[PDB]
Design a protein around this nucleic acid. Sequence first.
RNA 1: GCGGGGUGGAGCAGUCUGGUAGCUCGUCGGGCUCAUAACCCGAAGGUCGUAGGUUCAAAUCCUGCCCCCGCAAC
RNA 2: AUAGCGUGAGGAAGGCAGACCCAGGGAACUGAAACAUCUAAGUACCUGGAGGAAGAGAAAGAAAAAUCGAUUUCCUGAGUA
RNA 3: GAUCCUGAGUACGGCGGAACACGUGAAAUUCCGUCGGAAUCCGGGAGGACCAUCUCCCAAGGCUAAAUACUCCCUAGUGAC
RNA 4: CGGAAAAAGCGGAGCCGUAGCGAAAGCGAGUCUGAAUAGGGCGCAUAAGUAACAGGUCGUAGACCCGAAACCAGGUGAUCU
RNA 5: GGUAGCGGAGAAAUUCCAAUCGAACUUGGAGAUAGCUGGUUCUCUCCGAAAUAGCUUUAGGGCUAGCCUCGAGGUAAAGAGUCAUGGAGGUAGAGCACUGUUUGGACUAGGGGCCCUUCUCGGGUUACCGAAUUCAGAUAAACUCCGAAUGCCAUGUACUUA
RNA 6: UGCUGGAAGGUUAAGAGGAGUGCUUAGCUUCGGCGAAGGUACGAAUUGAAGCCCCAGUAAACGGCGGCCGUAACUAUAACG
RNA 7: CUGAUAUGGAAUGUUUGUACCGCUUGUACAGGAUAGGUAGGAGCCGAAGAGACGUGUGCGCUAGCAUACGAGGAGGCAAUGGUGGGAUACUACCCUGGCUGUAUGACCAUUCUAACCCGCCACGCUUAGCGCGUGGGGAGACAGUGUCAGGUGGGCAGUUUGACUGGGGCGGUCGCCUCCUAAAGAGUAACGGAGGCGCCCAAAGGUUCCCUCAGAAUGGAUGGAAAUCAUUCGCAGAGUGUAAAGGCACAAGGGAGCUUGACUGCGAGACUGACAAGUCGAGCAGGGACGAAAGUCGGGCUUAGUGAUCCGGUGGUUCCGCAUG
RNA 8: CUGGUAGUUAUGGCGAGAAGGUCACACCCGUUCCCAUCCCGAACACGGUAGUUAAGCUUCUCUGCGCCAAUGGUAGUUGGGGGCUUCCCCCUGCGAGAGUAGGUCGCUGCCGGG
Lengths: 47, 461
Amino acid sequence: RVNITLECTECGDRNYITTKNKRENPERIELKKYCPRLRRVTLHRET
Amino acid sequence: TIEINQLKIEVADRVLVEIPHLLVSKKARIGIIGQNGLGKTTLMEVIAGAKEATSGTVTTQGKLAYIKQLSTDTSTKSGGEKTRKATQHAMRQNPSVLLADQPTSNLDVESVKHLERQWSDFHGALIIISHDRAFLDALCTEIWEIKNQKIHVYKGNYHAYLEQKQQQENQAELAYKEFKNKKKQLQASQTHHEIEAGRIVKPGKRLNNKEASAFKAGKGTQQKKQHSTIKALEKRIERLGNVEKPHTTKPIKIITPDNRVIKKGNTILSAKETAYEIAGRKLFETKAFSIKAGDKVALIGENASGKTTFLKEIIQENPNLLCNPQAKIAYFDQELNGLNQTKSLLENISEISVQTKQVNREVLGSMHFKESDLHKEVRMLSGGERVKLLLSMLLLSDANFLILDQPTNYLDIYAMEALETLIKQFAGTVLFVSHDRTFVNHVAEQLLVIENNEMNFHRMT
RNA sequence: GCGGGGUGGAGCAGUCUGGUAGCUCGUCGGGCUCAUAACCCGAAGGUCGUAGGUUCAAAUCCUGCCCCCGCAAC
RNA sequence: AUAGCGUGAGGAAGGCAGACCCAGGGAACUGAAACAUCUAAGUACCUGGAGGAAGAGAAAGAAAAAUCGAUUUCCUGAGUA
RNA sequence: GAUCCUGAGUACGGCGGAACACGUGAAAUUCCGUCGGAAUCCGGGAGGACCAUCUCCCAAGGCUAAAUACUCCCUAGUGAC
RNA sequence: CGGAAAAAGCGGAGCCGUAGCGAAAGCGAGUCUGAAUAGGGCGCAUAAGUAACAGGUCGUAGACCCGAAACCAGGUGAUCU
RNA sequence: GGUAGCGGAGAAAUUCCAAUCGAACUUGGAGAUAGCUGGUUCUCUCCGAAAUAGCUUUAGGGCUAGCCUCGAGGUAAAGAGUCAUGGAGGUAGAGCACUGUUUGGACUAGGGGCCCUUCUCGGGUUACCGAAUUCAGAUAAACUCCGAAUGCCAUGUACUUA
RNA sequence: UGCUGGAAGGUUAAGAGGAGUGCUUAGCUUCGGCGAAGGUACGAAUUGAAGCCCCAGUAAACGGCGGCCGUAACUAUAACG
RNA sequence: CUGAUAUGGAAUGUUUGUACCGCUUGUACAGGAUAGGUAGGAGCCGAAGAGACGUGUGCGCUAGCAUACGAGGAGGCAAUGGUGGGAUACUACCCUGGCUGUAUGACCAUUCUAACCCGCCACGCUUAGCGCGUGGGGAGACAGUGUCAGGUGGGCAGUUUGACUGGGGCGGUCGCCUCCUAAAGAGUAACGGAGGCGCCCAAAGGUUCCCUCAGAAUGGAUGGAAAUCAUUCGCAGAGUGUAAAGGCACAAGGGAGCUUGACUGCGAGACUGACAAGUCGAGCAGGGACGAAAGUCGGGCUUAGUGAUCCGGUGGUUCCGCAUG
RNA sequence: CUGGUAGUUAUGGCGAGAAGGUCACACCCGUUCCCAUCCCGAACACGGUAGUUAAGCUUCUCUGCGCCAAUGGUAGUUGGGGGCUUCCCCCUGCGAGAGUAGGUCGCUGCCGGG
Ligand SMILES: Nc1ncnc2c1ncn2[C@@H]1O[C@H](COP(=O)(O)OP(=O)(O)OP(=O)(O)O)[C@@H](O)[C@H]1O
Ligand SMILES: Nc1ncnc2c1ncn2[C@@H]1O[C@H](COP(=O)(O)OP(=O)(O)OP(=O)(O)O)[C@@H](O)[C@H]1O
Ligand SMILES: [K+]
Ligand SMILES: [K+]
Ligand SMILES: [K+]
Ligand SMILES: [K+]
Ligand SMILES: [K+]
Ligand SMILES: [Mg+2]
Ligand SMILES: [Mg+2]
Ligand SMILES: [Mg+2]
Ligand SMILES: [Mg+2]
Ligand SMILES: [Mg+2]
Ligand SMILES: [Mg+2]
Ligand SMILES: [Mg+2]
Ligand SMILES: [Mg+2]
Ligand SMILES: [Mg+2]
Ligand SMILES: [Mg+2]
Ligand SMILES: [Mg+2]
Ligand SMILES: [Mg+2]
Ligand SMILES: [Mg+2]
Ligand SMILES: [Mg+2]
Ligand SMILES: [Mg+2]
Ligand SMILES: [Mg+2]
Ligand SMILES: [Mg+2]
Ligand SMILES: [Mg+2]
Ligand SMILES: [Mg+2]
Ligand SMILES: [Mg+2]
Ligand SMILES: [Mg+2]
C-alpha cells in the first residue's frame, strides 16, 4: 500500500496523487482524469 | 566500464534488489549468486537494458552480449546444442562485457570444460550466474551475493567467498553470544537492585516502630538511588544495540502424498533390443533390459546422445518399450513445455492435481512458494520456480513412475539436496537425467548408459 | 508477583522464519558368547502440558488455564 | 681573512593620564528562557609600539543608457539589503 | 612613437583558518600559514560564483595636513549640580 | 552655516502620509488567484495626516532595589603547612 | 632556600599550600545571572477581579483567551427578568420491549453412575447434574418500550428593568 | 576485553590523476536548437599509510570459574552413569 | 601513531605498467580435422630446397600443431563436393593473449654523499662541561621542524542526563477516536471505569437497476447439534471492512452492468475555537461518469488512521536573475 | 361504485370470518417478437381472454394479538423551610411511567371509466 503520483501522457505533468495496494495492483495504474493545462479529460498513468 | 548507482529493483510489493553504488572494470571476472527467487536474472536484464529499474541508473560502455537463462528457441536440436549455439552466438558478436545466466544448465563435462577454458582465454569483462562451484572457481575473481535485498561483495574465487562467509557467520554468532550474555548479566543486576530497593523500606525485626519511622525518608532516597542504577542499566542496554540473531535459512524437503505402493520387483518397463533413429540417422542400439518398481534409474549420455528422444519414445508407447499397465507415468522436459504459460500456477497445478487442495498447498509449501506467488503467471517465474512447479505438479498427479529429463538445471544447493532426498526416498519408480556427477552419484541405484551408439543397463552406481 | 521452561523413558534441539519430527544415551527383538556386558543387525516408542482460536494446514502464530525449576513476597 | 678584543662618535634603555589608537594574543559569566554552532566579543585583560592625535588616504575605486573624481568624520539610507 | 621600461616566488589557485553585516553558504573582495605558481601593454584587475561583451581602473613600493577621539594639566568661566 | 554654551534666517537631503494588490514581473482604484467576463482575499469606495510637547506602556541598555553558590582573566603568596 | 593554583607537595586522608581548599587569596570582566525569597516611602474619590480553559523540557513560570478598568463609537436597542408560545434533548423515576445479571417452577439436548445387556449397538433408566427452550417475578453508571421537573435555544408587540 | 607479534587479503583519508559532464561562445542554424578553442563549476577510474576486520600468543593482564535426570538388598544419600 | 608534501639529491636494481618491433597463439557442436575474424581469392608455394620419413624441444583441449636437426630432392594444398553461423590454399589489415628486444614511465629495496643532524673527539675564541667556528669521525635524504590528512584518545575540557504524580521515586501514562462518569442543550476533572487507532479497499468508491437478513419449525440420501434445498413464521433477534455510540430494511445491508467525482478552480454562509488548526457547505464555472430522464457523484453509514516550521530532493512555470546577454 | 394516485403518528396494523366480480384489478394461457433468469417465461418482458372468484383485490363483521387512552392517585422534582442526615420530613408549583375505565378494523383529498 503505497502513494502514487499520476502523470499525464500528453503533458507529463503530475496532476494527482493517490494510493494503491502494490500487490493487488502491481502495474502502473491508468485512469482518466482532468488535466487543467489542457482543460479536458486525459489519461494519466502512474510514474 | 559499467556504472550502477542508486539502483532499486522492485518486483510487485517486495523490494528485489537495492544498491547504493557498484562499478565493474575491464578485465573483470564476476560471479553473481543467490538462492532462487532473489533477483539475479532481473538485475542482469536491467543491466542489459532488457528491463527497466524503478530507480537509479546503469551506464554501459561498449558492446554487451546477453545469454539468457531460458531458451525460447523452440527447434529441432538438443538442449545442449541450443545452449552452446546461443553462447557461441554471444561470443561471435565480439562483446566488451559478456552477460550470462546459468550457462552450464544443460551442458555436460566436455562442454563445460571447453566453455571454462574459452572464457579463461577470453579477455574483457564478463558477468556470470551459475551454481556450478567449480566453474565459478575456475572463472571469477569477484563475487556478488544478492542476500537480504542487498549486494554483498566478496573477492577471489567461490573458495575465498565461502571462507569470508564463514568468518562472517562465526563473527555474528560471537556477537550475539556476547550481547545475550551482557543482557542477562545486567538484567540480572537489575533484578538484584529491585530486590534491594524492595528491602530498603521493610524494617528489620531488630528495629522499633518509632526508631524505624525516623529514617523512612533516607531509606526512600536509598531506594531512589537503586532505581536510578536500574535506569542507568537500561540505558546501557540500549547502547548495546539491537544486535540481530543470525539468519538460519530453512531447509527444503519435499513432502510427497502416498500415491500407490505397487510391489518392489514388479516389471515396470520391458524394453527389447532395437536400433533407433529420429531423422533416419542412427542414434544408438538398445540392448534389451527391464526396469522394476522402486528402481532409481539414472540415464547417462553426452550431448545429443538420444536421451530425451528415448524418453519421448517411452511416453509415446513404442511397442518395443512396454510399460506395464498401472504404471502412471509423469514427465518432466528439458525445456519446460509441460506448463501452460497462460495459467497462474494455482490454476496450472490445481487442474493437474488429482489430490486435495490442502495436499496441493503442502507440496507447494515444501517447494517453498510463498502466498504471494500463487497468482503469478508462469511467464513471471524464475528458471528454478518453473522447475519446482512442474515437479510439484508431477508429485500431485497420482504417478507411480516419474521420468525427469534434467531437473538439476536452475536449482540451488538446497533444492538439489531436497530433490536428491526426494528421488532417494521415493516410494514409486523414477528415471532421471542429469549431467551432475554429484547428484547422480548421490542418487543412482541403477544406471542406463549411452556410449559409442550403444545403450546398456547396469544395476550398479 | 517476575523470569525460564512443558516435544517418545532421560537430557537437548527444532519455535524467532507455519508444511520438515531430529542428536546422544536408553528400551524391545534377533545375532556373537557357556551366560551378562560391550559389539553387529532391524524395529518400536512422541498428535509436542492443556482448552480454545487464526490459517488450506500449527510443536511453530494469538489467548486462558494447569504444572515444574529459580528469584521475590510471606 | 673573518670571528673575537679594544678604543672613539652618535643613539636607546625608564616613567606616565587607570584617557584617546595601531598591532600581537585573547576569555568566561551571560543570552539563546537546557545547550554545543552562535552570542556575550574581537569586549575585559596581558604585551608591544607610539603620537598629540593615531589610523586611513590620492582609485588595479564607486558605480551604470550618467557619470563621479583622494581619505576621514557627521546626517540620512536603515533597523533596509 | 624603431625599440625599451612600468613594483615575481607576487598576482592568483589548492588545502587549512580569519576579516568583510556576510556562520562555506552560489561566496565575490581582503589577510595569515603551507603547497603549487602567471601574463607583463595585441598586457593585467574589478563590476558578489563563473563565461562573453561593455564600462571603469593599473595592483603587488612609500609619504601626506584639515575636518575626527580623549583630557593628568594651565587660564578665564558656566550650572532650574 | 550663522551666532551669546542664544534667537531668527538658511539648509527640503531625507522621513511620514497621499494607492493599493502581488512571491515577482507587473497592473493600478483596482489587484492576486484562476481558463474566467465568475466568486473570493486584500484594498478603494467609506479621504487626514504630519511635527513637537506631555501622560500611559513596550523594547534595547544593570532598567526597580538588594542578594548567590559558582565561571573567566591578570597578578600576590611556601615568614603557616 | 626551591616547588604556586588548567598548579604544586602528598609513608595517600579529598591531606596541606598563611585561622580559606572536591580546586587558595586578591583585583578586574561585574551592577554575572537569579522563572527564587525579601523590600518598594504621601492623601482622598470612582470602579473593582481572579485562583479557570488551552498550549508549554511545562507544572510555585509564561503566553493567548475568560474575568477588571479607562476612553471613544454604532444602532432594525441588540443586554437582564418574568408571561405566553414553539422546539432540541433521554437525566431522575419507572419498566423489561432488546442486551447483560438473576430467583422459583415446567421441560430437555447432553455428561456421570447402577446397569440389562453387548460388535456397550440399543434400552430400564437415574430427580446426580444438565446446555438450551418456555411461564411467573426481580435487577442494572456504561439496559431502555417509556419518561418528568428543572435548565437550554429561540420567537413576541406582551410586562417590567438596565 | 586489553597487551604483544604477524602480514596475505578486505575497509580506509588527504594528496596525487584528471576519463568525462554542465555553463559560457567564434561560428553553424530558421524558429527551436547544434556548437571548436579557451576559461569556468563539479569531478569518476586507478593509486593511496597506520588503525580496524583477521590469525597465533598472553591471566602475580582486565577478568571468569554451570545445570538436569537416574543409580547400592532400599531409608537415606550417591562412589557410578 | 601513521601517511602525503616542503626543507631535500645521486646512483643502481627487483617487481609490475604503458607503447613499439619481432616471433610463436587461436580446437564448442557438426565437419576430411586444432576453423580466431575482415576482405581478396583461383590458383598458390617451392629444386636458390616441396610433400612425406626419423629425432628433440615447446604448446596443449593430449586430437595433434609449430619449431629446428639427418637423408632426400619435387612435389604439395586448396578450388570442386559436403559440413556448417562461417572454409579450408596462399595474401594482407586486425583482434586475443604468451615470449624476446627497445623506449618510456610508477612502487619498493640497497648503496653513496653534498642538505639537515651529532647530548663524539682535537684545536681555537677562552681563565667556560654553555655556545659558535675549524678539522676529523658518525649517522644521512632517514631524523627533526612546518602544512595537510586518517586513527587512537576521560590524559584534559564544555555540557546533557524529561514532565504528570494524594511528597519524590519505581510501576504506568504523555498524540487521535468511541462509550460511561457528565447531573435530559453544549462543555465538564481525577494515577476515574471500559475498549480501540498510527490502517485498508482499484472495489469494500460513483451511478443505474434488482432484492432482503438472523434464527426456529418440520420434510428430507452422503450429512451429523449445525454445510446446501423446499414451505411457513420472522422489524431486523443479521449485516454495516475495523473499537464502541448514534443511525440504517421507502437502505447506508447484498448482487450485476457501465465506469473512475478517490475531479480542477473556488465557495455566500455556518460549526468549533486562545492562536495554530480542524469541520460542514448549498451554489457558480470548466470538463466528464452513470442513467431514457429526473437527477446523483468533489471517496468509503458517520465519527480515529496522524504530526508544524527550518532544511534538503523531484517535477513543472508567459516570475527574478547584483553592468548587459 | 370501482381502478389508480396521494396525505394522515397503527384508533389506520396483524389475525380470523363472510359476500362479490374477464365493467375494471386479477389469477390464468402462451413465448411467436422486444427483453429476460449465477439455472428456470417464477420474476421481468411481450402477445392474448379459454376457465375461475380459489387467492390477490373491493365491501362488510370482530377486540384474539397489537396500537391509542384519559380521570384520580403514587413517584420524582423547581423554589422555600426543617431535621434525626447510607437518609428523611413539610409548604407551594409541575408531574410521570405502570396499570385501569374507555377507543380502534381506518380518516380526509384528486383523476379516469362505469
Ligand atoms: N513481472 C514480474 N511480476 C512479478 N513477479 C515477478 C516478475 N518477474 C519476476 N518476478 C518474480 O520475482 C523474482 C525474481 O526472479 P528472478 O528470475 O530474478 O530470480 P533468479 O534469482 O534469477 O532465479 P533463478 O536462480 O531461478 O534463475 C521471482 O520470484 C520471480 O518469480
Ligand atoms: N525431431 C527431431 N528431428 C531431427 N533431429 C532431431 C530431432 N530430435 C532430436 N534430434 C537430434 O537428435 C540428436 C539427439 O537428440 P536429443 O536432444 O534427444 O539428445 P539428448 O541425448 O537427449 O541430448 P541433451 O541431453 O543434450 O538434450 C541431436 O543431434 C538432435 O539434433
Ligand atoms: K599619519
Ligand atoms: K568568502
Ligand atoms: K572600477
Ligand atoms: K475582488
Ligand atoms: K590571607
Ligand atoms: Mg533466475
Ligand atoms: Mg508441523
Ligand atoms: Mg542560557
Ligand atoms: Mg580575484
Ligand atoms: Mg579558503
Ligand atoms: Mg565572522
Ligand atoms: Mg594561499
Ligand atoms: Mg555581475
Ligand atoms: Mg613566587
Ligand atoms: Mg573518600
Ligand atoms: Mg558582563
Ligand atoms: Mg548582584
Ligand atoms: Mg462598589
Ligand atoms: Mg434509576
Ligand atoms: Mg441509567
Ligand atoms: Mg594488533
Ligand atoms: Mg568530563
Ligand atoms: Mg556555559
Ligand atoms: Mg517532578
Ligand atoms: Mg450534556
Ligand atoms: Mg546579469
